[model samples]
Every structure is written in C-alpha cells, then in structure tokens.
Target chain A: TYYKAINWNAIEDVIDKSTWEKLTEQFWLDTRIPLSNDLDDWRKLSHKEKDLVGKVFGGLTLLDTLQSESGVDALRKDVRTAHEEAVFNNIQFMESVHAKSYSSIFSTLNTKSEIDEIFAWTNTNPYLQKKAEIINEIYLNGTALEKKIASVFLETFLFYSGFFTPLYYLGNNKLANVAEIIKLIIRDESVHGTYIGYKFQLAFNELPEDEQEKLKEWMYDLLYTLYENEEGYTESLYDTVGWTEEVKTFLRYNANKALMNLGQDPLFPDSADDVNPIVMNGIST
Target chain B: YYKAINWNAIEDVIDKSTWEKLTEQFWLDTRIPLSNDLDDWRKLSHKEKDLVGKVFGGLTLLDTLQSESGVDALRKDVRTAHEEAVFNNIQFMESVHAKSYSSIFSTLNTKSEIDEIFAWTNTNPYLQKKAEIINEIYLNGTALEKKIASVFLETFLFYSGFFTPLYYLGNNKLANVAEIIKLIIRDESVHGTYIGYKFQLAFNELPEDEQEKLKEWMYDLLYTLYENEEGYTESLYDTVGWTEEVKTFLRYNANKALMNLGQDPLFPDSADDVNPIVMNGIS
Candidate 1:
C-alpha cells in the first residue's frame, strides 16, 4: 500500500517519466505549426482533391471534438487516481489541441463560408453522425464498467482509423507538418488508450469469473457492432476518393491492433494486412 | 464572409492565453527547506500547533479532491477551447498544491498527524457536503449548458475557499510554508477570475429567466457551503478561542469571491469595514 502511494507518478507506467510526464514535457506545444508551409504545394492539387481533403478532415474534426467534449469530459468525473487524472487531463487538453489544429486548417485554407460549410457537412454527414451516436450511446447510455471500457475503444478507433490512416497521403498532398502532428497525436492516443485498457483489465479481474465471461462477451459484441459501423463508414467517406479499399484495409489493421493491445484475440483477422505502406512509413519513423 | 486573419490562436484570447502565461510559472520548485520551519514549528503553542495540522490537512484535502476529481469533472461541457486549455492547467497546478501540503507533513515528520488528517478528511461533513453538491453538478449527466453553469458556480466556491485563509494568514506566518501557500493562492486567484470571465461569456448566452434562476441558485449554494464552513470553523478553532476571527475571515473572502465574479456583493460594499480584529499569532 505504501509502495503504491509513493510510486504514484509511475502508476502502471512501463518506464518512469518516459511514458507520460516526460513525453508531455517534450512536445509541450512550444511552437505553432507553420500552416502555410505547404500552401504553394496545396495549390497544385485538383479542386476535387482539395474538397476531398476538407470533407475527410470534416469527418475527422467531429471525432476529435467529440473526444474533447465527451470522452475526456465524462472520464474527468470518473477517474480519481492521481497520475491517472494528470495523464487524462493532458490527453484531454491535447484532444482540444487536435480539434483546433483541424480548425486551423479550415480557417487557413478555406474562406469563412467554406469553413462554415465544412462544419455543416459534419452536422449532416450520415456516416459521421452514426459514428458519433454509436460512440456516445455507450458513454451517455452505458451504465456498467465494461460499457465504459467499450466507450474507450471507440475513442481509440477514431484515432487509429481515418484520422490516423494514410499519413503520407496527407504528406503526399503536401501537409507533412500535418502528418507530423498526426504522428504525435497517434503516440499520445496509443499510450492513453493502452492505459485505459490496462485499467479495464483490473476492473474485470475483480469481478467473479462468470461475470467476467459475461462482460467479455459483451465487449466483443460492442466492438463488432462498432467494427461493422466503421466498415459502413469507410465506404461512405472514401468511396468517392476511390481509395476506399486501401483505407478500409488500414482501418481494419488498426482495429486488430486495438484488440491485440488489449490482449484479446483479433475479431476481423481476414482483413488485417492490406497495409497503406506510406502511412506505415510515418508511423514507423 | 472571406475575412482572413492568418490563424494565430485568436488575437484577443483570455482563457487560453491565461493558461499559457500561468503554466509558464507552474511546477514551482516545491523543494522547500523545512529545516527553517522545523524550529518555528516547535515555537507555536501546543493548541496552535494542532491548528497548523488542521489547517493544512483541511485545505490540502480540498485541493486533493480538486486535483484528483474536481478539475477534470468541471471541465465537462465547458465549451470553449480556450477555457478547456485553462482548465487542464488549473487541474495540473492543483496537484502540486496537494503535493506541497504532503511535503509539509513529510518535512515535519508528522506521520501520526497525517493519519489524523487523512482520517478527518473522509468524515468531515463540511468537506463531504462540498463534494456531494459540487459533484452532483459535474456528474448530473444533463444538458451541456446547465452543466456549464454548475462549473461556473463551482469556480466561485473554489475562489471563496482560496482567499479565506490566505488573506488572514499573511506573509509573517508559517514562513516557508507560507511561501508555498501563497503560490497556490496566486494560482487559484488567476483561475478563479479566468473562470469568472468565461462564465460571464456563457451566462450572457442563457435566456434572461434562466440567468436569474442561476443567480438565485448560486446564492443558495453559497449559503449552504458557507454555513457548513462556519460549523466546521467552530468545531476546529472554537475550542482554541479563534472562532469569530475565522468567521470574519470566511465571510469577508466569500463576499470577495462574489465581487470578483462580478455578482452583486451579498454582504456589504467593503470587507474589513468593521468588527474585524487581528489575531496576530494564531495562524
């Protein structure tokens, strides 16, 4: 008991400081991204590509904003562990940073009417709205502990999917700084999502075996539903860009990565390896 | 509609800018050499020493709740990105304040006293009531605008507590401990005002009747919390003959909290106007 109390800073951390505190300090938002660095390059894209980027990011923005407003907002009430609170606080702050970074793109490249239209698309977009409702149903509607963990998986999915996919595609379209920002964003989400999964393991272990099995089945059920939604969603968002197939491949790849990180068996094994090698390049570096 | 401003985090920012400016000074080196306070610790009356433990143990527990729960909880539904950034800073600094209090007991090597502090925190009705009421607002799982109002009211409650003791304790007492407390006090005052300003922005958006109802609700909560603190004050310091002094301090600061929040002062125009006497050595 005393040891846990004293070791609060490194609670469940794989390495002291390196995991959270130092990492937060290292990327402390010290410098703003040079939004215009890719402006000249941006002009070369066909108008259709520009609009596609905006539409994709519009979908991405809604996910990021929901995380800032809801996921962090809800957990802020629940988690009371000290380092855990600090970790989530920092992560939540960064979620808003993620929200604003998208806003920065909209305000920089697009006109006010165009920015308004982009946001409006998020409000009316069917796939985005369904994604939100399913995720929020668990957070706003889920009453049990297992359901809360399931909510976290949805938050993780937002990052590891389209927002995280095709990093070099954004870089390829000349927003390498945006790719770098995604790199940082993905690492932050990985550490935090893994931690939440670790916490879920502890909560589940404390339950009786029969109850644990019940919760396990419930989790798989929840993930499969969300997985199916993403399949529908990827088709909705990317069918136009004609990269729907590659994007679906990366989305599934990361979905299994989520399962593996949780120490669970992969649910969609067949769809895992048609990787986006350029996206893999940024993630690798 | 194509006005361009080149996107540099909003030109006239209040909440987020305050976060940046304040966090720059945060992580204040808490390595206080309590070697100095150790001697001063022995000089206080036995009863006065007991009061010291009570003082820190109590305030630090309030901070513990905030750092651990309150900060993150209140950030829910607090609309603007600017304010969201400020809250993260607010939450971060609160933990440091908690750590400072821990350092105090650790330095004095008062483990038994700390056990008392920890035990007392759970049972203290005043603190418990404070949490119950505030937690209800944060966790109400209700409308976003209503939750936002609850958080603003919460900032007032926090500001009330922040100023009450520090104003009375002043620079002369607790020496090194005083210095740490002052740092926390300064941080809270900035946050209190920032939230107050943010609240005004959100408050303006509410319909007129809702605004009036919220103000009335604010007073009701203030009175309940203040009355609880009054009872708590009598329980802790009344036996030491410092009850009235603490009450005066409490009311004066609570009123200041109201005024800082730009609400009509619930007491009088000037605090320190009358009947307040200086109890030089008690704190």
Candidate 2:
C-alpha cells in the first residue's frame, strides 16, 4: 500500500475545495441548537404524535449510524485523489454528528425509558432495518459507482422520508429549534449528496454505453424496491396522522432529485409542484 | 453488519465523554488569523524560516497518515459502535490538523518555499521513515499493537515539531500560529487519552503472558520510532541550535505516551528536566 500525503494546494478536482469549504463553513453541532427550547411544543403533542416523532428520529439515527460507520469509509476505498479522501473524512464526522443529533432530541424530549424503547423499536423495525441493510450491503461490498449511487440514494431520497416530519412541523411553526437542527443536517446532506453525486456522474459518464445501461438497470431496480419498502415505512409512521399520501409525494419528489443528482432521468412522476407546499417551503434553507 | 448504535445505553463512559469533548472543541484553520503573524514571519532568518516550514510539512505528513490510515485501520477492530463513532471524530480532526499546517505555510511562505517544503515531506528520509514505520503497524499489526503505534504518534512523535511552535509562542512570536497548534494539542490530548483508555481496557482483559508479550512489543516499537524521530529532530533543529532541547522534549512526551497506555514511564526526562519555556507554552 503505497500512500502519499494530501496536498490541498495542488488539487486534481476543484470540487474538493468547494465542497470542503461548504462543509467546514457549514460545520455545526447538535449542542449548538437549543433542543430544550422545544420542550413546550414537545409537551403539547398527544402520546401517539410524540411516539411518531420519536420513531422518526429513531429511524433516522439508524440510517446515519450506517453512513457514519460504514458508507463514507466504503466511499474512501475508491478515492481518486487524496483530497477526496480528506473530504470523505469530513463527511464521516458530520454523519456521526447527525446520527448523534437524534439522541440529543430524544434525551431532551422523551423519558429515558421511552428513549430506550424507541431505540429498541428502531433496531427491530422491519422496514427501517431493510433500508439500512440494503444500503449497508452495497457500502460494504459495492463497485465504486454502485457505492456512489447507493450513497446518493441514501442521502437525497431515503433521508427525506425521515426528514419530512421535522420540515412539516417547521412549516406549521412548531418545533422551531428542533427544526433548526434538521435544517443544518439538510444543508450538510445537500452537499454530501450533490458532491458525491457529482463524483458519480464523472465516473459514470466515462463508462461504455452498455456498462452505463447495465448500471442504470440495477439502480432503477434498487430504487423501485426501496420505494416499495418506503411506502410501507411511510404508512406505518404517517397513516395515523393522516399524512401518508402527502409524505409519499415528498418521497417521489426527492427520488426524482436523487436521480437528477446522479445525472439520471427522473423515475417518479411527482415534481416539486406535486409535493405539499408546506414541507417544500420549509426545505428552502 | 451490525445493529444501530444505542447512544442512550453507552457501553463505555469514556466514549460518550470524549465525543462531547471533541465536538465542543471543534474548530477550523480558516477562522485563525495566520496573516497576523506576518511580521514575525518576516523577522525570521532564512535558515530559521526554512526550519519552521519543514517542521510543519513533517507534521502534516504524520497527521495525514493518522487521519487516512491510522484511525481507519484501528476502526476495523473496534470493540463497540460507540468506539467507532469516537474514531470518526478523531479522524476528522486529524484531517483538520493536517490542513491547518498548509494554512500556515500558505500564509507565511513564498509559493516556492511552500512547494519546496511539501517536496521535503515527500522526500525527507527520516520523516518518511517514521510515517512508513507507524503506517506498517497501523495496517498489519495486532489491534493492541496498532493502538501502541497510534499513542506514540499522537502523544510522542508529534512533539518534536510541536516544540518549535511552542518555543516561538513562549517568545511572543507566531502567537496566532501557536494558537492553532494549541487547539490541535488539546484535541490530541483527548484523542491520546481516549485511545489509551481503550487500549488499557483491552490490555487488562488479556492473560498475564499475553500482557507481557504486548508490553515488550510496545517498548520495542517506541524505541524504534524514537530512534527515527531523533534523526528527524536533528535535521529540523540542528541549524537553530536546539537539537538537544528538542530531543529532551521528545523524551518527555515519550514517557507521557507510555503513562497514557497504563505503563510506567520509560524515560527519565520528566517535566522538570525539559525546557521550561516550551513547557510554559503547553500550559
């Protein structure tokens, strides 16, 4: 294993600096946002509503744990430059922060026993487990391009399902502080998905047409399977609140964006106009 | 391959406390005023300035290895999810520390000087040898051996170059530059402590025979790294007439590195024996 030290001044890809600057400037911690301030809004919710919130965060924590622990390291294995490896290191740390942020919210709003049970549920929830397993499998042993697509899907499309609840509350002017944390995570994910997706597009565009087509087939099939599972996931979380359909629309819109990020065509018909305006408005930051 | 991490039920308090401490201490080199030290930079003789740039270039290489290989390798053998999470933070900060040196180089040196210094890092035999030695262990050694390599690099090897900046800070020169190093030192303090704590946990779980074998290997590895670091310090400090003092500083830190790993100090150069001025900057 011959290794060379990273020289930031002599960059092979300009995006490394741009993405590094964007992420570091946007650097934040869960401790910075006052999660305790949301206690009043937290107390106002019914038990079922509160359970939905905890479960949403619990599922998100699982996904982030996958990214921090596995996904970024997998991406680093195929780095084209030392600078890209450095950028992935930054991404890994923030994923850790994002994963831990959910617990910050839980520790603030939920009882200790409730927090423990939420994690227990998050650990065993079949749909949530399926999503994590699908992504982790690719991360552990996928092609360079396959890892990128899986990463983009996780970052851009999959996270939005867990993300929809916070943004919805933000739109209605509830949980402003908690929503603030989600906004920070969203900003980081925007860069993570776009930057990693940009790298994928570069490598992807270089492949022969047949190879590209084959990859597209695998990607679309993965998305369709993931989307089917997500429908079950969304219904489990949102049906009690009567928000399942709207949440599905949000998922479709983001799935399309995930495709766009990968330099692929939209697989879902839902557009920005099709998503609920409230959540759309909350995502602007 | 594993279950989602349960942060609420932390298996080790050190992992939780270290994570909080690290995030709380998060910083970026961009925030520092490196240019504010231009006056000090201009005051240095050519020989003196060359030493400074080369020292940082050497530090940069070690930090790069720590971030890219050392932590990533140790991560493969983590005992807990919480421990892996903690390594991620350490890895990121190591990148920051590596990049912070470039921030200084770009601010303080001419383009040619910066280029030359980076080339030195690529070619300097002693510096490259130290990195190669530690990296070999990081990649292929037993898990406990990797931890030994890490603590030595983090707590001991870094101080030879670190002493130069602290020496300047003691003289009120390169104050802002020293500030960046101080932040890195603080982060490394937690890093070394946490990793050492983890090492102790694993070491204590081993049988007495296994423990004796590891202790012998640890001391031998430290001696090997120390021998190479001596050559590196001499090359960097000879022109400045500080080689002897810098070696003392290295020995002091080597002892601390051992103590951090739950072993008796191997060197006789304790705090009182090291140069007080450099020691003052550390505080």
Candidate 3:
C-alpha cells in the first residue's frame, strides 16, 4: 500500500511547471473566447438567448470552485504516498494556475448579468431544486459514510461534466491557448477520477453488509427529497425565466439524458431496495 | 417571400402519431424524472451498465444524426437557409443535451480493465501520458463559437473522462445515474457555447487580422494528425456487435461538429458570404 502511494506521487512530478503554465494559459484563452465573441451583440439578444448565455458563463464560474478551493484541498490531503502526493501536487499546481487564470480572464469579460441569469435560472429549475434538496440531505441527515457517498456523487457530477465534458465535445475547435491548458487540467482530472474510483472501491470492499444497507436507505431518502423538491424547483424556474412549455420539455428531456449518462438508477422510491446487486457489491466489496 | 416557399404544410393537418408518442412515451415516461429513487438499477446488469455508461442512450439515432451527421446533410440540402438553420438548431440542442446528460449519469461499476487498478499504485501513468499530449503546442486550436467555445476546450481535453474516467474513479461506489445525466448536461453546455460563439464570431463581428493569424496556426494541425495516426487504429471497431452503418453514422456525426461555418462543402476555400439576419429571418 505504501509503495503504491509513493509511486503515484513520483509519476505525478514529471508534468512539471511548464506543463501547468501551458494548461493555465489555455483555460484563460478559452474563457476569453465567449467574452470577445459575444461582446458585439451582448445587449441585443433575446431574453432566452441572454439566459442561455449567462448560464454558460455561470457554469464556467462554478468551475473555478473546483480548481481553486475544495478540489485543490482534496488533492493535497488525499495523496499521501510519495507517488500519489507528487501527482496531486502537480494537480494542485495546475489548479492554482487555473484559478488565477480564470479569475483574471473573467475580469476581462463582461458577463456579470449572464452569471446572475444562471442563478435566476437555477432558482427556478426543477432539477436544480431537486438537486439542492439532495445537497441538504447529505449535509444534514446523512451519516459519515452516506455523506461520503454523496460527496462522491457531487464531486464526480461536477468535475466530470464541469471540467471534462466540454473538452470532449469541443474536439478541435478549442482556442489554441485555452486548449493547451485544458488538456493538462483534463489529464489531472482523469487521474482524480481514477483515484476517486479506487477509493470508493476500497471503501465498499471493506464495508459490512449492514453498513451497505444503511447507505442504500440513506440514498433512498435523498432521492425522496429530490423528488419532493422537483416540482417547486421547476415552477420557480419557469416563473423566473418565463420558460415556455417547449423549453421546459427540452430541459426535462435533456435532464433525463444527463441522469442516464451518470449511471444513476431511476429515482423511483423502490429502486433503493432493488439496486443492482453487482454495483452494490462493487461499491461495498 | 411567401410565394418563394411552400407554406401550406406549415398550417396543414399532420399526423399526430409522432407527436402523441413523443408526448406520452418520450416526454413523460422517459424524458422527465418521474421519481427520484434508484429503482432502474434492478433491471440492469454489469454488461448493460457498461454499454449505457458511455454516450447518451436516450437520444434517438435520428436525433443523433440530426445533431452530428446532419451537418453535411444540411450543407448538401441547402447552403442558404435550410442548411444554416438546421446546423444552428442542431448545434444549440446538442449542446444542451450533452451537457445535461454528463451530470445525470455517474459510473458506479468496476467492469472495465482500467478500473481494477488503483490510482495511487500506478503513479497515474495514463494521466501523465494524457497530460503530455494535452500540453502539446498543437492542442490549442481556434474557437468555433462563443457559447460552446469553453465547452469545446473542455471536451477535447476531457473526452476520455466523459466516457471511461468514471469507471476508474470508484465504479458504482461514487457513480450514480444522476451524475451521468450531468455529463450530458455538460455536453449540451459545450454545444451551446460553440453555437453561441460561432454565431457571434461569424456574423456579429468581423475576424480581426490577429484572429485570422490564429486561423493560420490551425492549418499546421494536419501534421499532428500523422504523428497521432496510430492512435486512430482501434480494434474495437471490428467487434462482433458493432456495425459499419453505426460506425459511419457516428463518424458523420463527429464530422458535423468540425464543419467550417465559413465555407462550402464542395469547395473548401469558397466562402459563404450570406447575411446572418437574412439567413435566420423567416416569414
């Protein structure tokens, strides 16, 4: 175990400072693309267009949190073995640069209203409202293990889509400077994703059956909270954004696909009990 | 203008079969979240999990083609209005769907080969390889659109993470269905960013001389294609269940995302100088 940890850090150090700088510059450049491209028509877009634009900007802002605050701390604390530590250290270095770069890049842009629009959209979005309830459940009623599970869910959902999803879909269209930096960040996230998966596997493997059962129940409770909160959330978003039924339909369909891609079972109350046995075993092995 | 195109179909009574099925099955049962519990897992197996874990399974093949493959089709159909409108719509919708789905689905199973190993054990060698590739000078390319520009950056750097990264992270432990859904959402965000950015860049504003200089830098990317040619050869394409039609469909779809907003399909160097407002305007 010690050897495993040490080797991880050793490999991480190889990425070096130049790599981080390149990645940081890329993200910075990427952030600027929207600002520069949209500046000419910023005030003329329709409400819907403005809302969409703002939401995208807000999405990027939320990404800053991942690179600068919690994710950075997580990387620092989790990778203790020499190899693991070095790898995480490099990640931290890249994140530090990312945080600074985004901060600076965002400073250069004019999308404050766009960010506000995202908040407004989220306030009313049923799915987001449901998600907020899940957040409350994890932070409130969930036990240590349950909370950890929730954290895993939250982190993976945020990082995978927040950090990497954009990268995959963009392909070769990325801004040269931003693309380079994101590539490095993407590399770090890949490692982070792997590390998180390994830890979860280890945790599940060591858990007792009863503990696993408890975790399932907790998940069910969280799902219930989400379901209960969804209606209010959806209504709120509609009121805030004046979203049409057509738009809502699109949002709902989009949301379903998002849920499906994440490997989440449906949100039925009974699903907790009927959880895939193999997956349950994999988690608590 | 009214006489120029057929308008009777716009007001004509069309069959409601597609609409009715879409409303009942697609919109309600499948699209919207009816419940929030984890019941769907009961019916799925590890193999099913693996299959659905990557890509948006809920998207119909037609929708996928319209979003990805239809670009070339649009170009073939009409470069003036129908093509541009379809391309724009596809860009926008694909962005929304892809981004949303990424967050919803979370990989929670450990069936893949890469998932068996620990991250702390291997020194994250794979990550290092990826990072090196990502940091390569040629990785930085031009933005296609404003809305999807950042998302595009994220996608290129993080494609592996979108598909296979979650499996290695904790396989079912941290993975959940909702997380996977979120990935789709993120994908859409990129799509949105791209369309938003592309529209802004193409019509609203003229490309600066410096921006044009940046475009020149991209032509050099053809060279890296040769260096990375080996990576393109995948045995997975020959799998028993995979079909050439599906492969072709996916390839066409992928190419749509890369289509040049400034040029024609038949003549690469030929520019489409049509006005954006005129293109978007319809009676």
Candidate 4:
C-alpha cells in the first residue's frame, strides 16, 4: 500500500481544519494551573469532604484513562479522513493530559496512602468500572456512528457526575485553583463532544431511513442504560454528601445536552434550571 | 478486555517522568509569532528561499510519517498502559510537529510556493525512500525492530532537515521559525530517549544471542537509512553548498541515536565534526 503524506491544503472535510484550529487554540496543560495554591483551601475540608473530592477525581481519572488509552484509539480506527485521524490524536493526548491532571491534584492535596486508596477504590468500585466498561465495549465493537455517540456520552454526559463535586466546591469559593483545571477540561470536552457529535450526525444522515431509525433506537437505549448505572454511581459518590438528587438532576440535564449534540430529541425533561445554582454558577461559560 | 490506565501504579519511572516532562512542556505552533519574521523571510534570495521551503517540506513529510505510521506502529507493542499513554503523547506531538511547518509556510511563502513545496515532497525519490524503508519496518517488523526504526527516524533522520533551521537560528536569521523547530527538537529529544529506553528494557530481557542478532540488524538498517538520508540531504542542501556540512550533522546525530538505543556509536564523526554553528544552536 502506498502511504500518502497528509496534505493540509487538500482537506476533505471542512470540520477537520475547523476543529483542529479550535483544539490548538485551546491547547493547555494542567501544570499551567497553580494547583499547589489550592493547598490552603484543601486543609479546610472535612475528612468526608476530602474523601469525596479525592474519589471523585479518582473516578474522573479512570474515565479519562479509558478515553485516552482505549476510546480515542478505537475512534481512529474508523476515521473518515487523515485530518480527522490527526484531530483524534490530539483529542487522545488531551485525554491523557486530563487523566494526569488528576494525579497532579492528588499529589498536591492527598498523601501517598490516600492516593493509593483512592485509585484502589476506583479500580474496584462497581458503578465506576461499569460505566467505563459500557462505553469501552461500544468503542471496541460499535459502528463508527455508535463509537462517536459513545464518545459524546463519555465527554458530555458521564464526566459531569464526577465534575459536580469540584464545581460545587468552587461555587462556595473553595478549591478555586483546582476548579480552574476542571473548567479547562470542560471547555475542551465541550468542543470534543460537539465535534464528535457533529461527525456522528454527518454519517447518520447518510444512512437509509430505516437504518437511521434503528441507530436512534440503539442510541436512546444506550443512553438509558448508562443513565441507570450513572444513578447508582452518583448515589455512591454523593449520598455521603447528601447531594445525590441534585447531581442526578445535573446528569439528566447534560444527558439531554448530549442528545442535542447528537441531533436527537431530549430523553429527559431536566433542563439547566434544574441544576444546582452553585455548580451552575461555577460552570458559567 | 480493555482496562483503563492507572497512572498511580506506574511500573517504570521513565514512563512517569517522561509523562510529566512532556505535559510540562506542552505548546502549540500558534503561540509562536511567525509573522514577526516577515522581514527576515523577505531578505532571503529566491535560491535561499527555495532551499528553506524544500527543507521544511521534506521535514513536513517525515513528520507526517512519524505521526501517522511510526507512532501507530510502536503503539501496537506497548508493554504497559503507561507506555501506551506515552506513545499517544508522542503521536500527538508528532502531529503538532507536522502542522507547525504549515504555520511557517503560510507565514513565509505564497500559496503557490507552498503548493509547489508539497508537490516536491510528493515526488522526491530520496524522501519517499526514507519514509518507505522505515514504514516497512514499522508495518512488519518485530517490537525491537520497530523501536530501532523509530529511534533512527526521530534522532537521526530528522536532523538533516533540522540543520537548516538550526543553522539559520545560529546566524540570527528566521529566529521565530527556528523557535518552532527548537520546540520540536526538545519534544523529539524526549521521544527518542523514552522510546530508546523502552527498547533497552525489552532488549535486556532477550538472550545474548538474540540481542547480538538484533544489534546487527539495527546497525545494518541504520547504514541503509543513513545512505538514503545522504541523498535526501544533498537533494535539499547541494544547491546551497551545505551538503557536506549537513552530512556531518547527520553523522553526529546518527551516533547520538545509536547511543539512545543502548549501542555504541557507528560513525567516527562526533559532535566536534559537526558544523559549529548548527552544533551550538542544537540546544
């Protein structure tokens, strides 16, 4: 087989360059944030508050690890253009960046034993592992459209459950530097979810009507299954803080947003208003 | 059967350190103000301009190979999840290195000149052979073979084209453009070392007989690739009267690449043999 150089001038999809420019413009490192500065605010938390935050980051780390190590590579297997593959490579690396930033936070705020226990919990946690596996399975076996849907779900829907803790704390002006990192991650995730969802819509529209309807059925079904598992996952992380219901509402609202990105009807009535005001305020674009 | 990466449970210290070092040095081409170099760019004669465009165009081609084929191949034999994550970082940076040339081209050359440069790389026989030889190993070779190809490509092959920019930087010309090249060289320094370290881990695990056989294969491949790089170098540098100097630079880097692979230097030429200007600007 002949290998062709990736000629940027001969772009096949306009979105490839659009997304590439946006992602490059948004390029960042976790080191840029003064995470160590959060040390003072960190000492003020209750042990429960501390553990909640640690495990929340731990959970987010696993999701990003899956995204970096497994999910992005799988998406690359079905790229529509060489430029699209380049875009996915950038996304994959940022996922690693996101994953490692959690470790940065851990080293800053927690002890070695605490960090070890947090990772151990993430490895054994039933709901967290289930969520990673569910999306990972689709990445490994799903169609290209299905893979993009899975990515959007992970980016837009699943991550926010863990994201809720940091943003919630930020609203009250605690862990302000730590929350700055999450906001950067969110900004990147926003573009990732939207760009991937746009890619999915392009391919889906090209399918036959019956095929489109069938995939829609699968998409909704997949979302419901992930939502069900996410409910249990939320309860485990938030029941201690007594914010499980509030976080569930946040999850549902983002679930609808994920749907909107996919060019589909919302499956949940939960809207932005239903999200907690403090966390809502923390994420102001 | 997929498992998420556990960065906290890293088995290799190199993996952890390289990951931190790479992200710590994260940058984008957009941050460099290439437009500021328009004065210097305009000062070059057409012949000098052609050399610069052709050198960058060749580099863009090789970086394309590294990003698209080299990293993807190395990824398949990754021994650790952390190692795989490192390869992903290398892959992404390779993509950045590839696009960074476009930033230079758009800033310094006309659209038609940019098109002509890409057209040259497409048909350049020496350039195509360099990519094909390494891509063959990446596509079909064993794990150790793939690592050797990667080290040679990053540490050795890239230096020929790298010399032009470093030479210009040493002379205080095209400083902004050279800044982008310097960042790429810094990134490649990590990539070559980290991948070479990984190669040693696996090579050390082998029986001595297998290790010797592999060493022979690697050196032979290096010589073959080096010969092609000479043709590639001359093709870009001869018109500028810099072919010999560029070859000495290549030899210096060739030894450096072998050292990275845990082997002795193959070339008698050392850093002292390289052009002092390029050697001084390498850091």
* Top candidate when judged by lDDT against the true structure: 2
Which of the two candidates, 2 or 3, achieves a greater lDDT against the reference?
2
The best candidate by DockQ is 2
Summarize candidate 1's per-residue lDDT along B1-283 as a digit string, tens digits: 1111112435437754685667665554345676677776676687876766666766666676666656566666566555655676677677667657667777764557667666676667676776666566555633333333333433444433333345334534456766676677678667667666666677778799888877777777678777766777777776677667556556655665665556776765345442332322123
Q: What number of backbone clashes does candidate 1 have, counting pairs of residues 3 or more apart or in separate chains?
A: 0
* Alpha-carbon deviation at B77 in model 2, angstroms: 2.1
Measured with C-alpha atoms, the lDDT of residue B165 in candidate 3 is 24
Stretches > 4 Å off in candidate 4 = A36-40, B1-8
Per-model chain A TM: 0.85, 0.97, 0.49, 0.97
Candidate 4: tens digits of C-alpha lDDT, residues B1-283: 3344666667888888897788777788878899888998898888889988888888888898888878888888888878888888889889988888888887887778888988888888887777778888888999999998888888888888888889988888889999999999899988889888999999999998899899889878888887777777777777779989988888888888989889887779977888888877875
Candidate 3 vs 4: which has more DockQ = 4
Clashing pairs in 1: none
- Best TM-score goes to which candidate? 2
Query: How does residue A254 of candidate 1 score in lDDT?
Result: 69
* Backbone clashes under 3 angstroms, per model: 0, 0, 112, 0
- Give per-residue CA lDDT, model 2, range A1-285, as digits (tens): 244667777779899889999998988887778888889888999977888998898888888899998889999989987888889999999998898888888888988998889888888898988788888889877889999999899879988988999998899999999999989998999889899999998999899998988999999999999999999999888988889999889988999888988998887788888888888889874
Instruction: List DockQ, one per candidate, in order.
Output: 0.13, 0.59, 0.02, 0.49
Per-residue CA lDDT of model 4 for A60-87, tens digit only, reads: 8888988888789888888788888899
Instruction: Give lDDT per model, in order.
Output: 0.61, 0.87, 0.34, 0.85
Would you list the rank order by TM-score, best first?
A: 2, 4, 1, 3
Which portions of model 3 miss their true places by more than 4 Å?
A: A1-35, A40-44, A59-67, A71-82, A85-148, A155-195, A223-235, A238-285, B1-283
lDDT of 3 by residue, B1-283 (tens): 0011111112212212221221121110123342342455545555444444322322221122223322322223221221232233333243234323322332233333222323311243333332233233223422232222222223222232233323322233223443433444344433433343343444335447655554444333323432332232122222323333232322222233234233212213211232222112200
